[PDB]
Homo-oligomer: A and B are copies of this chain.
Amino acid sequence: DAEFRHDSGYEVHHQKLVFFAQNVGSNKGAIIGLMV
């Protein structure tokens, strides 16, 4: 048998100025800020 526990702490604060903001806790796909 097997017991599994997991804690993932994700935090972010005080983004005064930003033109493209992308805060993702976990990704398994495609993340694009800008594409043509």
Interface on A for B, CB 8 Å cutoff? 1-36
Contacts and interface: CB of A to CB of B under 8 A. Distances in A.
A24 B10 CA distance: 9
A12 B23 CA distance: 8
SS class, residues of chain A in contact with chain B:
strand
A10 B4 CA distance: 20
Contacts of A14: 13-16
Contacts of A25: 8, 10, 24-26
Contacts of A6: 2, 4-8
A23 B36 CA distance: 22
A36 to B, nearest CB: 5
Given A32-B35, A33-B32, A33-B33, A10 B7 contact: no
